[PDB]
Design an enzyme around this catalytic site. Structure first.
Site, short mmCIF file in Angstrom:
data_model
loop_
_atom_site.label_atom_id
_atom_site.label_comp_id
_atom_site.label_asym_id
_atom_site.label_seq_id
_atom_site.Cartn_x
_atom_site.Cartn_y
_atom_site.Cartn_z
N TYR B 171 -6.78 4.80 4.00
CA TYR B 171 -6.33 4.19 5.79
C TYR B 171 -6.07 4.50 6.72
CZ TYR B 171 -1.65 3.66 8.23
OH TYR B 171 -0.87 3.11 8.71
N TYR B 181 1.84 10.87 10.03
CA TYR B 181 1.24 10.39 8.42
C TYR B 181 0.30 12.53 8.79
CZ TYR B 181 -2.09 8.42 5.18
OH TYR B 181 -2.03 7.79 3.71
N1 LIG Z 1 2.17 1.70 0.99
C1 LIG Z 1 0.90 1.66 1.83
O1 LIG Z 1 1.24 0.95 3.48
C2 LIG Z 1 -0.30 1.99 2.01
C3 LIG Z 1 -1.37 2.23 2.41
C4 LIG Z 1 -2.65 2.89 2.83
C5 LIG Z 1 -2.97 2.72 1.49
N2 LIG Z 1 -2.19 3.41 0.92
C6 LIG Z 1 -2.38 4.67 -0.60
O2 LIG Z 1 -2.20 3.52 -1.37
C7 LIG Z 1 -2.18 4.16 -2.89
C8 LIG Z 1 -0.97 3.94 -3.77
O3 LIG Z 1 0.27 3.92 -3.37
P1 LIG Z 1 1.60 3.36 -2.72
O4 LIG Z 1 1.19 3.37 -1.19
O5 LIG Z 1 1.21 1.68 -3.89
O6 LIG Z 1 2.47 3.87 -3.48
P2 LIG Z 1 2.96 4.18 -5.39
O7 LIG Z 1 3.93 5.22 -5.27
O8 LIG Z 1 2.61 3.13 -5.17
O9 LIG Z 1 1.78 5.25 -5.52
C9 LIG Z 1 1.61 6.45 -5.42
C10 LIG Z 1 1.74 6.90 -6.91
O10 LIG Z 1 1.04 8.58 -6.59
C11 LIG Z 1 1.03 8.77 -8.58
N3 LIG Z 1 1.13 10.80 -8.18
C12 LIG Z 1 1.30 11.04 -7.12
N4 LIG Z 1 1.16 12.51 -7.17
C13 LIG Z 1 0.20 12.85 -8.74
C14 LIG Z 1 -0.14 13.43 -8.90
N5 LIG Z 1 -0.09 14.69 -8.53
N6 LIG Z 1 -0.76 13.44 -10.90
C15 LIG Z 1 -0.62 12.05 -10.93
N7 LIG Z 1 -0.19 10.97 -10.17
C16 LIG Z 1 0.12 10.90 -9.22
C17 LIG Z 1 2.87 8.71 -8.53
O11 LIG Z 1 2.73 7.95 -9.31
C18 LIG Z 1 2.98 7.64 -7.59
O12 LIG Z 1 3.46 6.08 -7.99
C19 LIG Z 1 -2.46 5.41 -2.53
O13 LIG Z 1 -3.57 6.33 -2.53
C20 LIG Z 1 -1.95 4.55 -0.94
O14 LIG Z 1 -2.13 6.44 0.19
C21 LIG Z 1 -0.92 3.15 0.66
O1 LIG Z 2 2.39 12.28 -0.76
N1 LIG Z 2 2.50 11.56 0.63
O2 LIG Z 2 3.17 12.25 0.95
C1 LIG Z 2 2.08 10.28 0.16
C2 LIG Z 2 2.08 10.05 1.68
C3 LIG Z 2 1.41 9.00 1.48
C4 LIG Z 2 1.02 7.42 0.10
O3 LIG Z 2 1.10 6.57 0.60
C5 LIG Z 2 0.90 5.59 2.31
C6 LIG Z 2 2.11 5.22 2.23
C7 LIG Z 2 1.63 3.97 3.73
C8 LIG Z 2 0.94 4.08 4.20
CL1 LIG Z 2 0.93 3.47 6.25
C9 LIG Z 2 0.14 4.97 4.04
C10 LIG Z 2 -0.11 5.91 2.81
O4 LIG Z 2 -1.47 6.63 2.56
C11 LIG Z 2 1.40 8.10 -0.65
CL2 LIG Z 2 0.81 7.10 -2.14
C12 LIG Z 2 1.97 9.45 -0.96
#
Ligand SMILES: NC(=O)c1ccc[n+]([C@@H]2O[C@H](COP(=O)([O-])OP(=O)(O)OC[C@H]3O[C@@H](n4cnc5c(N)ncnc54)[C@H](O)[C@@H]3O)[C@@H](O)[C@H]2O)c1
Ligand SMILES: O=[N+]([O-])c1ccc(Oc2ccc(Cl)cc2O)c(Cl)c1
Ligand SMILES: NC(=O)c1ccc[n+]([C@@H]2O[C@H](COP(=O)([O-])OP(=O)(O)OC[C@H]3O[C@@H](n4cnc5c(N)ncnc54)[C@H](O)[C@@H]3O)[C@@H](O)[C@H]2O)c1
Ligand SMILES: NC(=O)c1ccc[n+]([C@@H]2O[C@H](COP(=O)([O-])OP(=O)(O)OC[C@H]3O[C@@H](n4cnc5c(N)ncnc54)[C@H](O)[C@@H]3O)[C@@H](O)[C@H]2O)c1
Ligand SMILES: NC(=O)c1ccc[n+]([C@@H]2O[C@H](COP(=O)([O-])OP(=O)(O)OC[C@H]3O[C@@H](n4cnc5c(N)ncnc54)[C@H](O)[C@@H]3O)[C@@H](O)[C@H]2O)c1
Ligand SMILES: O=[N+]([O-])c1ccc(Oc2ccc(Cl)cc2O)c(Cl)c1
Ligand SMILES: O=[N+]([O-])c1ccc(Oc2ccc(Cl)cc2O)c(Cl)c1
Ligand SMILES: O=[N+]([O-])c1ccc(Oc2ccc(Cl)cc2O)c(Cl)c1
Lengths: 292, 292, 292, 292
Positions: B171, B181
């Site tokens: 991200y 964040y």
């Molecule tokens: N949603 C967004 O806007 C966004 C934007 C940019 C990047 N991301 C990245 O995408 C990836 C997927 O996350 P998401 O946003 O889809 O949320 P999500 O909730 O779908 O996925 C996060 C997952 O992390 C897992 N998790 C947390 N701690 C753990 C641990 N100690 N061991 C094993 N599993 C663990 C949980 O299963 C959780 O479902 C993340 O790396 C997030 O940072 C998300």
């Molecule tokens: O542990 N967290 O706090 C945390 C924070 C953010 C997480 O995903 C995102 C959700 C939204 C955005 Cl913008 C970026 C991210 O990396 C995730 Cl998977 C987990």
């Protein structure tokens, strides 16, 4: 039923051809834009079957070149072609080869299209290092390989459906210096990579069309060789020796990445430089005394 | 016969699920790695028919889930499991959920795999901002969100075919600052992005495996709502207003990109951050002035 | 006893002047290169004391303008000046104003110098967005603000001692898009930032001379205003509201950074874009719903 | 009356010492923060006259060392000190050496300071490469080399004047991969660089303080020799051969840059990585081909 216009094939050893090839795989129909100093020769060869080897994909798989068109990215509209070129031995009798004209030609024969490929560059003083490059050479370098994009874009935008996608081929010398990539070329690729962003902005908001650029690794093309075993044999040797991915780098490797950017699968990517280069760009130093 | 393991997923509203849908289009077998604490509740929903709708890829094909395993990114091996979590209610009814444990498991039952996905993050103190973040908190964030990728690669490499491919999700908060964040997440992604390069070289040179990361734009997943009208509702609001690409970013948008990077079609891309964010990343200021 | 040549002052409200000012502090002697459409007016004003306010540093501190010279960065040598300009009302009777000629003039009156400042840009179609920019406008934009550097360099290199240092002023629109910075300007700054690298390479190895570029923040200059409360009042408002450093941004702020790059203190810096902009560039999003 | 605290220095052959010399030119008071384990041996050498030579700034002025304190970047506060190190021979004869402890000390005796330097790193498993680096090892590297900057900022902010300035020292291994620089160090610098931005915003907006980082090229310091004809003798060899700037990089080269960033002269620079590496960072391939 997608159509793509490829600006810049002169033979089967360039990136143009690589792109053309992989685009066939996905059954997309291909229009070649060909520089008049080579048009007739490319044509003849093609009729002669000189390319039949190189048009082979795999199982029963030939290519499907829809149409092969003369095209010069120097001239935006016909009012640009200067008299000397209008009269040149090579250009003499060919018509509708400016940017504006091919857009029309294409739109007439085939209507709207949805894929545009910019795989061209030209620079007169390439062999001169930047410091010793003339103004007239530099501005030439940028005209032919940076602007040709912007202008391809203005004009081709109206013969393109929304959700169409555009790509171009850049080189890493824009970001980090590689000497002997001169006479404007490094400036030109630098500008092309910035224009890729700005154009993505306008085309995105206004037309729902995407544009990206592929930072290609070294390939033994006609033009690469023209740059004075040369700079490109070293470039290849070095890359095959030092890149994280040690395999040989094929034009189809860029081709398949190109096809992807061009397709719907990459609808969420725009304005990006994507390096397709066996990951050389990620390196800082040769790993010599580390490989012991 | 391709198998992809996805580490991190507790529901259908996340990115991992976006990735799994799109790979199923390519007939890729999916093994899920689920955080033990939500592993049972996820199993129940699955069993109770809550995902049947989300599992449809299209007219007479659904999602092929080969298996679903507890997986915890905090613990590399058996020895790493601490008394409190051996105790812990949610953890005690489960076993072989460490990185090295799910690696051997998958491999015991189904052999070598060839696509790996790290789609997980945790930052205990996300709520705080970097300056007020504690050492214990910060490192927990680096441990679960950054190092877990390296540990995944190390333990999973043996059980993978050469020419395999690994992805991570990152991200833009790592490159340009995004207030809110916090708690280490930026630092974590900052490190994930660089490790992607370093590993890209080791894997690249030694096992002929490739590794890239996907800089995704915002998605309303459960993780994102737990940051908190939520620092995701802004993210989405802003992005849909300002991003070059007016479309609404879907999980499958990332999934299609993931599918590609994970395929042979991109054999020449390693070590890259690939932005799949509707191009928001390219913008400098809001364009309010211009739009007039 | 160092001398600096400043290409591009027309009044006291630009970055030129800011630079000039701080360079005086360090007791360095200043030569102005002045565009002929403004030369006579700048001269008259100066004699009139219109700048006496603005030449004040602090305690007894005036400035020390060594010499004030007509200069047009469009023309490399005198053989370039076209007849229409050679005859222009403004250019008519002024001599030795090309790049080659000022180098000589300076070297004659004062011998070798060791500090060169490029604080100029020009672009005809600036008010046109990139997509709607003519070729002839774009190449103009790059000629006047990208190449003028390369050429300043070729020529000034021989009237410079080894260890001399060179700078230029760029804008962040090269890296991230800011709309309405068009007609080539974003391409031009993009190229200028790449040329800064390449030139650093050649000048470093060959002459022991350094070159850098300063990514300046928004200042209310003559030219800034000329860009059609305008784009630059917004630019300032936004920056004063959103940059990590909330203070107002002065030309002397760049001036003092310029002086530093130019001096021996920065002997280990070359080919760099240094942002002097109250840190705006580091931001991704406005922090609106974060400031609650 | 300016006071600078420097965290991390065990001798004169390092960067911190380069920084202290150059600030002494500006009559800046220096407080040293020394890793407890080498604190006593450093004290002895100092006392025995081993640094008198290195302390000369020039003709009748030497280095003004206000004080020298044990300082350990692993421990934020008193509570953070663990039994084994309360025990530990080198640690037991010392006190108030945690981040919060040296902060109160300095402040108790000499009041508010206004320049802060983080010039320290540790990576227990530097010897291994990222893939073979352990979780315990990796995080120890992030803890001591990355988080220690945040903790320094937090505890030292109260005791600093507004318009103060903080620097850190980073390395290109974070951006482009350098094999040999392992055990977390790349990841660590990767995070240091991003934190620099995030903190640049918090400090920037809240306390009007600035923070930047210096990407230094190679120096034969004790830390660098302990990586190990040593992955520093290559670094230096390569750099002096390939870097745009043939000169040999001295510690004071960085010191002069540090001095500047730490001064008012740069009031408009925050959140930046500033490369002070003779420009090596700009190069792509070795230039062997070109040099012919
Ligand atoms: N949603 C967004 O806007 C966004 C934007 C940019 C990047 N991301 C990245 O995408 C990836 C997927 O996350 P998401 O946003 O889809 O949320 P999500 O909730 O779908 O996925 C996060 C997952 O992390 C897992 N998790 C947390 N701690 C753990 C641990 N100690 N061991 C094993 N599993 C663990 C949980 O299963 C959780 O479902 C993340 O790396 C997030 O940072 C998300
Ligand atoms: O542990 N967290 O706090 C945390 C924070 C953010 C997480 O995903 C995102 C959700 C939204 C955005 Cl913008 C970026 C991210 O990396 C995730 Cl998977 C987990
Ligand atoms: N091969 C490499 O090592 C390499 C690496 C990185 C990027 N590139 C880029 O890839 C692209 C294609 O080059 P290539 O290496 O495949 O060699 P190439 O010789 O196949 O490509 C040049 C082609 O463009 C055409 N062309 C030249 N000037 C033109 C003009 N004014 N109008 C219209 N067409 C014109 C020529 O007919 C020629 O076929 C260029 O953008 C180049 O900068 C090449
Ligand atoms: N002010 C800003 O907001 C800002 C921000 C970032 C960068 N810059 C850059 O700073 C530099 C100076 O611009 P400024 O903002 O101080 O405004 P300015 O009007 O002071 O600078 C333009 C100056 O260059 C001179 N000039 C124009 N064309 C010329 C030519 N062909 N030959 C010789 N001289 C010529 C003009 O006489 C004028 O004094 C430019 O490089 C610009 O891109 C300005
Ligand atoms: N020497 C180079 O080639 C080079 C290049 C780029 C960056 N750097 C960076 O410059 C900075 C200064 O290091 P250097 O290379 O001059 O070596 P150095 O030995 O001078 O400094 C490292 C210092 O870190 C300190 N230290 C280690 N662990 C500590 C802890 N837990 N608590 C308190 N102090 C601790 C020791 O006092 C040691 O002297 C480092 O961050 C290094 O990463 C150095
Ligand atoms: O006309 N030229 O000077 C020229 C210069 C370079 C060209 O392409 C490249 C060829 C090889 C490489 Cl490595 C990078 C390139 O951008 C091309 Cl197609 C044309
Ligand atoms: O001639 N122009 O079009 C033009 C355009 C922009 C110019 O400078 C800037 C003025 C303001 C800003 Cl924000 C950035 C700049 O690069 C200048 Cl000096 C001249
Ligand atoms: O703890 N280490 O292993 C370690 C490793 C490297 C260290 O400094 C460097 C020494 C040399 C180089 Cl090139 C870069 C550096 O960051 C330091 Cl101070 C400490």
């Amino acid at each position: 039923e997608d159509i793509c216009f490829i600006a810049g094939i002169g033979d089967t050893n360039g990136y143009g051809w690589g792109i053309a090839k992989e685009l066939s795989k996905r059954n997309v129909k291909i229009i070649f834009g060909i520089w008049p100093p080579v048009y007739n020769i490319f044509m003849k060869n093609y009729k002669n079957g000189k390319f039949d080897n190189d048009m082979i994909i795999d199982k029963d798989k030939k290519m499907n070149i829809l149409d092969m068109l003369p095209f010069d990215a120097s001239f935006d509209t016909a009012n640009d072609i200067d008299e000397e070129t209008k009269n040149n031995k090579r250009y003499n009798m060919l018509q509708n080869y400016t940017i504006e004209d091919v857009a029309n030609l294409i739109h007439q024969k085939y209507g709207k299209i949805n894929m545009l490929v910019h795989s061209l560059a030209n620079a007169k003083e390439v062999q001169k290092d930047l410091l010793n490059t003339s103004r007239k050479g530099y501005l030439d370098a940028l005209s032919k390989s940076s602007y040709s994009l912007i202008s391809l874009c203005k004009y081709f935008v109206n013969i393109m459906k929304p959700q169409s996608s555009i790509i171009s081929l850049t080189y890493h010398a824009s970001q980090k210096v590689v000497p002997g990539y001169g006479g404007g070329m490094s400036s030109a690729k630098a500008a092309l990579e910035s224009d890729t962003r700005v154009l993505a902005y306008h085309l995105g908001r206004n037309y729902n069309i995407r544009i990206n650029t592929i930072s290609a690794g070294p390939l033994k093309s006609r033009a690469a060789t023209a740059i004075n075993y040369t700079f490109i044999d070293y470039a290849i040797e070095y890359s095959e020796k030092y890149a994280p991915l040690r395999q040989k780098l094929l034009s189809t490797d860029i081709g398949s990445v190109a096809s992807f950017l061009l397709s719907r699968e990459s609808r969420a990517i725009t304005g990006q430089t994507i390096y397709v280069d066996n990951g050389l760009n990620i390196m800082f130093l040769p790993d010599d005394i580390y490989r012991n």
